[PDB]
């Protein structure tokens, strides 16, 4: 009857999300601040009920959801639009109603529905019967409790905002556009993805990279970082010749792979060397250059045209 | 109240510019929080230029 | 064998609905006049009952349903067509008959069906056979409601009248278009939304922002209002310098956030200030200007065209 | 030399933002100018 | 360090050339696994000539 959704989450902080402090503010003000100081919302000023997160894929909308979930410390429920549909063709709404009930039970709750456009639009079959009735029930629930007394926040997600049912559109509050990250944001992402590896020269290199990286997503950035991080492994795998690093302060010998001409260049296999006594090469900028070369831009320009259309029409929007 | 349509639209326009400057300032602050000096300098400079134009 | 389907006491007065006085009048004639003076409907003036509210979303159709429910003091039953579609694999429609029975037992009574278009058409996978008989049941109940003496009122609500099954339309009586609010209705709604909040100068502003919102819905207004309300709160969130407002005649010194150039400007965080001794900034027109800025035009004109079409084709004639 | 100066810069920026929030342009100008000069001095 | 900018692209170019050389070497190795001396030696020749141009 229940169909269990988990609310205990990892530790993704506000600072792990680069950019749009105004959206962060909106999240804090819609969630944390209300809980903090409830007396702020006496009389005619009332908390947000709906927020749509939209834009290209890979931009940490899910990441943001995890971050809010970390920071809010209240019942955070999150669900796929596909999830909890039906079994015997027409038994669908019981679980929906029960779910909205469950949101009511533990105020202040947060519902995250991924890919809200999957339960949207009009033509037939599902939008004649099943997806019709389900969409309808959704609509009745969402404003049902929303206006007047509320303890739920609904967060939607969509990559295709332009296919969002007009009715649903008008039922839903606050649109937030997620633009591709700018110089600063990308730089910050690089700094996040520094890890333990020695960061060759300063942050100026990250600034350079951030500038060099144009139009890419969080996901893209992460992948390029991973790619660069495999390069020392690759190098190790390639070498026969290694050389000792270990100065007299160290306990035992410590070996890094090197060119055949090197002073103390011994030529056994990496497999023969123990994990501690192996010294991975540090990460230089050339590995990141290679990483960049390998992974071409992931983003077609033609999606941004529709995204920008939506932006001009609705955009940073209340609705 | 001294042209409630036209002058008020101009006022709104100016407020939008001011808002943009505020956003720039915020960006600069975030950059400094990550010790990203040149970017902060850029953002502050761009804000100040618009201030000087206003 | 009861199975209770939502009934409750909303508290929305006539006066809380701004505009649409012609429809309001029609509805007072649709509900209250019949109940007050039934003997007026002997002869060829007839107790009209089935009434459709149709138009774009966000225009307080649900809000109006709450208002007449508050105002008419007649038993208001409120239901989605999704609700109680079936258990089996066999038996439906009994619940329908029971609903009709209970409404006949609770005269004067009102059934409100939101999104009546959810029941329509001739598709398969259930609608050809299973929900056909549900449809039929409905049609026979609404046939019998006009038979003998009526105390039941049917209110339809739809955004998509062109997707409403014709057979219903042929059985169905009065149709009323709910348009987007005009200058006056917008203006009044603003004033309604203010209430206790410090009202700034005169009606000139209310009329201006009335004029400057063109084509927006009640909902569209409300979000903008809430944004403006949150603006002074934003002004408190960004705070170093505060300053005392209230003189020694008052209970205590009362502090509001101010610019560093202010005289008597004491610097701390908003968190450092106690709730009573905090003086929220007033509401200026700039807050509303920014609330406008956060709401880009919300209108899909195709919908308007379609509503005009429907209005011209169905509603003029009885059908 | 480099930590408290950054903090001061941040504070000045905050001040400037507050000023702008209350349409106090000259204060904003002076605070941003102080922030910038201080940044140049680092 | 003063830190260059326009030389990064040239560094990338040199890396591309080195990558090409490495590819040539790999192909040569592949061709030597089945004792195709002519293929391997043409590829090595190519690698060596371009490295001499580097
Ligand atoms: N600071 C960050 N900002 C943005 N994205 C990040 C950040 N840190 C990690 N990521 C990336 O976010 C991805 C998680 O999915 P993500 O939230 O980007 O999808 P989405 O934005 O919900 O859109 P879609 O679901 O359509 O892809 C991971 O691949 C991860 O590398
Ligand atoms: N006087 C008013 N007129 C119109 N809308 C209002 C009014 N007062 C408040 N509202 C807003 O209208 C919403 C009430 O739902 P509404 O009746 O507009 O939906 P609806 O028009 O029935 O749309 P749908 O048919 O898609 O459910 C609330 O969000 C509320 O803030």
Curated annotation (Swiss-Prot), chains A, C:
Top-level lineage group: Eukaryota
Membrane topology, record value: Peripheral membrane protein
GO BP term (any one): late endosome to lysosome transport via multivesicular body sorting pathway
Main location: membrane
GO CC aspect terms: ATPase complex; cytoplasm; endoplasmic reticulum; endosome; ESCRT IV complex; membrane; midbody; nuclear pore
Keywords, in A-Z order: ATP-binding, Endosome, Membrane, Nucleotide-binding, Protein transport, Transport
Compartment(s) of residence: Endosome membrane
Gene Ontology molecular function: ATP binding; ATP hydrolysis activity; identical protein binding; protein homodimerization activity
Region (Disordered), start-end ranges: 246-266, 300-319
Residues that bind ATP: 55-62
Claim: Cytoplasm is one of the keywords in the record: no
Function statement: Involved in the transport of biosynthetic membrane proteins from the prevacuolar/endosomal compartment to the vacuole. Required for multivesicular body (MVB) protein sorting. Catalyzes the ATP-dependent dissociation of class E VPS proteins from endosomal membranes, such as the disassembly of the ESCRT-III complex.
Recorded family membership: Belongs to the AAA ATPase family.
Subunit structure: Monomer or homodimer (in nucleotide-free form). Decamer, dodecamer or tetradecamer of two stacked respective homooligomeric rings (when bound to ATP); the dodecameric form seems to be predominant. Interacts with VPS20. Interacts with VTA1; the interaction requires the dimeric structure of VTA1; 6 homodimers of VTA1 appear to associate with the dodecameric VSP4 complex. Interacts with DID2. Interacts with DID4. Interacts with IST1; IST1 competes with VTA1 for binding with VPS4.
Protein name per UniProt: Vacuolar protein sorting-associated protein 4
Species per Swiss-Prot/TrEMBL record: Saccharomyces cerevisiae (strain ATCC 204508 / S288c)
Residues of the full protein shown: 119 to 437 of 437
UniProtKB/Swiss-Prot annotation, chains B, E:
Span covered, complete protein: 277 to 330 of 330
Subcellular compartments: Cytoplasm; Endosome membrane
Name of the protein described by the UniProt record: Vacuolar protein sorting-associated protein VTA1
Organism from which the protein derives: Saccharomyces cerevisiae (strain ATCC 204508 / S288c)
Subunit structure: Homodimer (in cytoplasm). Interacts with VPS4; the interaction requires the dimeric structure of VTA1; 6 homodimers of VTA1 appear to associate with the dodecameric VSP4 complex; the interaction is ADP-dependent. Interacts with SNF7; the interaction requires DID2. Interacts with DID2. Interacts with VPS60; the interaction occurs at he endosomal membrane.
Region described as Dimerization: spans on this chain: 4-54
Outcome recorded upon mutating residue 23 to A: Abolishes interaction with VSP4
Family: Belongs to the VTA1 family.
Region listing for Interaction with VSP4, in residue ranges: 14-54
UniProt effect for mutating residue 36 to A: Abolishes interaction with VSP4 and dimerization
């Amino acid at each position: 009857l229940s169909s269990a959704i988990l609310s205990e989450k990892p530790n993704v902080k506000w600072e792990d999300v680069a950019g749009l402090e105004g959206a962060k503010e909106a999240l804090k003000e819609a969630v944390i601040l209300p809980v903090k100081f409830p007396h702020l919302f006496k009389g005619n000023r009332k908390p947000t009920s709906g927020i749509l997160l939209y834009g290209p894929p890979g931009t940490g909308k899910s990441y943001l959801a995890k971050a809010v979930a970390t920071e809010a410390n209240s019942t955070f429920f999150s669900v796929s639009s596909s999830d909890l549909v039906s079994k015997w063709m027409g038994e669908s709404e019981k679980l929906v109603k029960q779910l909205f009930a469950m949101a009511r039970e533990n105020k202040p709750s947060i519902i995250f529905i991924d890919q809200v456009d999957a339960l949207t639009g009009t033509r037939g079959e599902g939008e004649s019967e099943a997806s019709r009735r389900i969409k309808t029930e959704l609509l009745v629930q969402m404003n049902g409790v929303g206006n007047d007394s509320q303890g739920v926040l609904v967060l939607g997600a969509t990559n295709i905002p332009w296919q969002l049912d007009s009715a649903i559109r008008r039922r839903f509050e606050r649109r937030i556009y997620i633009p591709l990250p700018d110089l600063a944001a990308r730089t910050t992402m690089f700094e996040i993805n520094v890890g333990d590896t020695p960061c060759v020269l300063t942050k100026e290199d990250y600034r350079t990279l951030g500038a060099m990286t144009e139009g890419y997503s969080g996901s893209d950035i992460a992948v390029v970082v991973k790619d660069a991080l495999m390069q020392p492994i690759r190098k190790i795998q390639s070498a026969t010749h290694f050389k000792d690093v270990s100065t007299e302060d160290d306990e035992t010998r410590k070996l890094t792979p090197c060119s055949p001409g090197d002073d103390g260049a011994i030529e056994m296999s990496w497999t023969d060397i123990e994990a501690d006594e192996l010294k991975e090469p540090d990460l230089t900028i050339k590995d990141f250059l290679k990483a960049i070369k390998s992974t071409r831009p992931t983003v077609n320009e033609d999606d941004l045209l529709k995204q920008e259309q939506f932006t001009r029409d609705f955009g940073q929007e209340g609705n | 109240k001294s042209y409630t349509k036209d002058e008020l639209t101009k006022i709104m326009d100016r407020a939008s510019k001011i808002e943009q400057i505020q956003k720039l300032a915020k960006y600069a602050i975030s950059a400094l929080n990550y010790e990203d000096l040149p970017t902060a300098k850029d953002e502050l400079t761009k804000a100040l230029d618009l201030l000087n134009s206003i």
